[PDB]
């Protein structure tokens, strides 16, 4: 291998490979801590997070650290604590990577048979997979424990705007949890991105943690079956290709999850979603015209036209205008006004709360459908309104990363298959 | 539309199961 | 269905009781915290059930209780409810009580 | 044997068959000239030479025949609208028949020089092989070319023996075939000076005769003979291709920008005359001069000739056209049949209003009525738009001076809007669109079609120079014509 | 000295030829005298114009770094429409020998364009000279004919056909984007079959590039014919049905496709230079006008072009002195 | 042997005139269905109200349309991202009215092209060739996925996808420029550079090989070095061919990523009113002219009449 | 905003996020210094 | 603003005189 | 002809270049800073884009008499 | 080894204006605007 | 195999013959170069006149002539 493909020489150098992976993990943790500190430095805890381009602080706030009712910052210290802890753990991990890369043994096969592995060995590496699966399950159970105990998580669907609350009865029903997986990925049904309550999220993480722990123990204590050996290519680049494909799929799923979901990504921190801004604009226009004394039942007034209300293709009362494309949006400030047949005519009048109007106006001002690469504004924009939604940044970046890692699946899978075949 | 839906589901299921069996027919 | 009517009657009754106390009495405030906790529990339990969601009584109860929670969320608690908003809320409570039967 | 893009290479080594194929192409060209002249005469309409000019009917070779002097036809009519008397042998049909008879004779001569390729002339006595003395051939044919150039410039254009070239006034009102006295001064290089043509062709003929005599009496140097590969026909093919695309570029540029060799009465006006308001400025000067010596608006505008107003119209602009919009100019927007007259727009207050004329770049242009200061006093709002300065609200009234509509005033907003839309195109004219079923979209004058065709041809012949010269220089790594040298 | 069978004494020309065509790091050649000065001054003029020369007078724009422009917005803008097709010599009547006024008038654009066109001519002459020296067939110059044809048609023929140099492309990024949008709005350049053939040529050239560069690096032997031709033919016959039998034909096709596409594109640019629109389906427009319910993507494209023209001409062509009231500007609401 | 074994060996057979393969087993029905529906819809289909309002647009033949202007209209804005098969529509005419054929065609065609790339890899593996042809073909399929999908996902409706036509494609490009300013985005810039470089490299490689192919490669390399100062250039033809493939593929990958970014509203650069004088007055630039053109396109795009 | 006890370290935490690209640049510089390229 | 900044920049850009290192490979050819 | 390797290691190169390149960079800095760049190239300063009696962008309208027209438009 | 050669002329005519323009633009970056 | 002999062929034989001979050395190349430079200057002059770059008092360069 040449200089550029130099890392490819570390396929059989178990000690150096371990050191390099640990060093990259230390780099990841170092970025996490450093960017958390950077976002804490420029926070101004009197302004919404999505108006300052913060991504890590919404993640910490969703856990329920330093937040109150309506997504108000009680205190900023927990974010600084998290940044410091990730930073110091990153320093430790970097020292470990430096040691195991150079000072430590170059190959672990002979001195430490427990830590020695060969890519062709189908049992030791399955044990490694079991160990790290157990670690992932422990992390999921840690999240679940933080949910039910040791404080709560920020439920945005709580009445009055949403707040931090303790999940007491997570949805542990198998049918409800596993119906998301078979749910179609299209309009209305958003696969796993359509989860709308925190109970389902906590129950699903319970299920995935238990399954991961059980599968880790199983793969630890069971050799692969002969059909499994026959059906797969067993080489390091093949495992790399499998990981790349899976992680690219996860990247695409994360992109869609951040773009469309507002439950696991509260709108008070990440800003309104795509459909949310348009629905908020329609709601604000409707409430303004209703205050001015207009007939909101007949949209702008003609029954044959739809600007404030319209019949859905299936026969539901939905907002008029272009917002007909976003009639599947569900929001904490809009659900109380929605009856069985979509929006309720009676509930649309004399039932709109002031906080709902404030949230609708705020989300209308900051539309993710307006963004011009750190300059903001809707469509053709000149200046001002410097708002690019963090949802847009997350979606674009992780979509690009997922596509690149799918390309990695293609490249490494082809190379591994050719090498195994002998080409 | 019921008959059309059943026909389309049958065709798709047949093709998908044939494809799965093809990758399960002596192909590593 | 699924003993929803019992919890609905309980929450309606405690809402009426909480609204029935005098403003200066601290038991009013203690009942406000208790009612807020009950509201959060009830909405968390029953907003995720489509079978319950189909009932119009659930819609009326959700609208009234979310209006009350929004009132207590900002410029509320020790601030008296506006007359028109309170009347609409009580009308929703009465509709729910009638429609449960 | 040879591929489809190499078959005509079979005559590269046979001077007789080369002469035969060149004769065949020449016969085809002359036959096309005759056939096109006959067809255009058969489709031409000489009834109205003012509002239905020869460049509005799509005539292509009639402009050239009239340019060098052919103005009469055997049908009893002339290009000037008069009645022909004793048209003579040299009419449009006469020239067509002449080129056709020449085509037939050249076809027969091509057949003869083809069936008898093997001639003792083509073989040099030194080697007894088919060889052409390219420098001497070039000298002889260039001497002939220069003699013909001098004869044409001194006897035809000058009018000593020939009829003379077509000369017209600057605005294309009184144009006819007249002899021109050669102008040897600096104004002889004025491209709009007709005498420059005669002076140039005379001087170039004399210089060409001298150059032919020299290149015929003086052999080339060995260094130039090797450097230019003078022993191969492919070299002279490449150089001829270069010369012809240079000439095509020059002639297309002159046709597009206009010159004394492309009168506007024959090929139509240019787009730069409309861009700069040439005819508009002339008409305004004429009407101001008429108004200075008393008179009236109606009299002053009726004193303007119809042809001059016709030139001031965007329909005659060659730029306004389409690549696939085939046919004559009359085939789209109809045949002109009369001039309505100048339309003066005045608002309800009394201020005169002027319509912002449509530039050439805009297929559709907003209708804006400006004042003398350039402020937008009125406009036609976009389709079903809120009106704030619409002609209905402003109250614009249009009065017509001269032409068919003289002294008529219209205050109806529909008619005023229609006339404003027609006036943003320039002078308002009446067209009939039922005789030819005109589609109402603008076609291009023969000026534009000629410019497009010959510019594309020059661009392709640039690649011709490149390719055939690449074969010339790199004959060693290629295959083809042989070469010979001596002394 | 011994040219041909005979021989002549060496002269100054022979010494100059020996000095120019000798082997060194930078091959000068006879064509170098035309290439290096012209290309060097074209690049220098472009850099100087994008760095110091302004366009506040020619176009009423800031197009230089000291005016606050970055790499994307900086450009060497064309002169004003008033000068029409003036060549704008620094010693000419417009500049009167004043370098500052010459730069202000926009003559640097003409300087760059003309010296760069002569640089392109010298570059293809250099290609011919080097091919002759190495004794190779000069297909590279034939391929390079297409870029020169495009440059001549766009930067020279089009402004000459139009009112003046003002409508030629300005040497810049945002300027060339404006030029592209200008042809979109005023000429409907997408619907022209010649840019259609150019699009087909470029996309096919990219396709052939990728296909060839994958087939090679996918067919090299396990260890000029470093790749297996038989396996490539079998692969491209079992998939897609048709495969290129021989290497010579495939490489000739890769030569031919982009060059002919670009040549057709240049012909279309000439057609635009004479303002000759193409593919104007007037029947669609008549049907849409008489029937408001009828609508097609062609009519929507026509409306978009009208909007582009009306909303761009106010500032794109300052010489017309045209101001549009808000009521006359086309909008979708009014339609 | 058994019928199943015979069918399997026929499918995997490389001796057929056209290779089918297991990926092709899924590919062929999808591609044939998409082709049939596209032909039927293009030839004769009722007008589709793409905007969702009751103002249909006719893009099919037999309805006053030709090949150049003809297209398959994207589904109605009312449907949005909803899955709209035939059986979910009230009636066949109502299905055609809302633009269902576009969704059917795009879904079956995307499945077809994915299975086509899979089949390309499958044949490359069966023949023993290196499997970099599939990763090269991954770029056009990525662009197709970003154009026909992803972008409707980001915008929230399939009506924003590119129509299956010529004039429809031009309209889609113009509207995309109006809404996102794709020209100033660095990734359409990278795609333009990629395709221009692909054409340039294809032309030069063809010319060099055709000149060298007589009746030397080192002579061609020397000529290239003398022409432009790349005497070193690549180590051999291996690096040359790999770079030849990599340039356009990387360009198309980057332009697909860019279109995805604009799908999630991350638009390109905008320098409107980025230059001011001392007094604060705005000094125009070329980007301002581009902004004016975008304004015209956007105002004429907004059919806010119903 | 950082706590007042850690206020003076504002430039340090401003520079910290960019450090990983400095690591990759350092890796490139190390590769060039040993001069395999 | 300060000319001392210009001196710092000239000192920094002086070591960019390693341009021959860029082209030495291009001059590493034999060509004979 | 001389290889690029030895020039990189030579006292003469690293002295003449070390004394000339900073001088050139300072020359460019002073050319920009002293305002000479505005004067020689005619680029208006940020405080003189809109001179008195011209509150809009300039426009050359006469081809032949463009010298004094540009001089007048530039505020003399 | 001539002091002035074609390579020397080319490299100097490319670098000297490049250095001058780089210094210019570096000064340009710090204009108060 | 001698070709056909015709009276016109014999008449024109001296012209086609004499083929291939050259003057030794550069011959009259310098005179040709001088004439080429003069023609280039003339072309530049007429191009400038027709482009209005060269404005002569005697010439008008407009349609009004
Ligand atoms: C996350 C980034 C990362 C990490 C963690 C590593 C980690 C490692 N690299 Mg690596 N590398 C990287 C990026 C990275 N690299 C990049 C981007 C390139 C391209 C420029 C390279 C090119 C490269 C080469 C060429 C080599 C390494 C080698 C190594 C290993 C030995 C450490 C070393 O080089 O010192 C020095 C090791 C010595 C033996 C010298 C003794 C002193 C080590 C585990 C080396 C190796 O172990 O090869 C097997 C090796 O030769 N890398
Ligand atoms: C005009 C004119 C003149 C002059 C000319 C010239 C020749 C000039 C020069 C010019 C020049 C010659 C300049 C220079 C320039 C350069 C520059 C300005 C630089 C640039 C660079 C950069 C910008 C960087 C980039 C980079 C790299 C490469 C790496 C990575 C990163 C980056 C990308 C950043 C004369 C005398 C004729 C006279 C007349 C007028
Ligand atoms: C290829 C040649 C590129 C030359 C350098 C491009 C970068 C120019 O730099 C530009 O200088 C201006 C000075 O005010 C700044 O305003 C801009 O922000 C900056 O991008």
Residue numbers in the entry:
A (entry chain C): 21 to 443
B (entry chain I): 1 to 28
C (entry chain 2): 30 to 130
D (entry chain B): 2 to 488
E (entry chain D): 3 to 225, 241 to 352
F (entry chain A): 11 to 225, 247 to 337
G (entry chain K): 10 to 46
H (entry chain 1): 1 to 32
From the article:
PSII is a significant protein-pigment complex integrated into the photosynthetic membranes of chloroplasts and cyanobacteria. Its primary role is to serve as a light-driven water-plastoquinone oxidoreductase. The assembly of PSII is a stepwise process that necessitates various assembly factors, some of which are conserved from cyanobacteria to higher plants. PSII assembly is facilitated by auxiliary factors that transiently bind to discrete assembly intermediates and are not incorporated into the final complex.
In this study, we present the inaugural structure of a green alga PSII assembly intermediate (pre-PSII-int). This intermediate was isolated from chloroplast membranes of the temperature-sensitive mutant TSP4, cultivated for 14 hours at a non-permissive temperature. Due to the instability of the mutant complex, the accumulation of fully assembled PSII is impeded, resulting in the accumulation of the most stable assembly intermediate. The well-defined density enabled the construction of an atomic model representing a subcomplex composed of nine subunits: PsbA, PsbB, PsbC, PsbD, PsbE, PsbF, PsbH, PsbI, PsbK, Psb1, and Psb2, designated as pre-PSII-1. PsbJ, positioned between the cytochrome and the majority of the other subunits, was absent. Within this gap, a distinct transmembrane helix named Psb1 was clearly identified. As a result, it is proposed that Psb1 serves as an assembly factor at this stage of PSII assembly. Conversely, the assembly factors Psb1 and Psb2 (homologous to the cyanobacterial Psb27) are present only in pre-PSII-1. Psb2, composed of a four-helix bundle, is observed to interact with PsbC, suggesting a stabilizing role for pre-PSII-1. The pre-PSII-1 assembly intermediate at the PSII acceptor side exhibits a distortion in the binding pocket of the mobile quinone (QB) and includes the nonheme iron. Notably, the absence of the Mn4CaO5 cluster on the lumen side is observed.
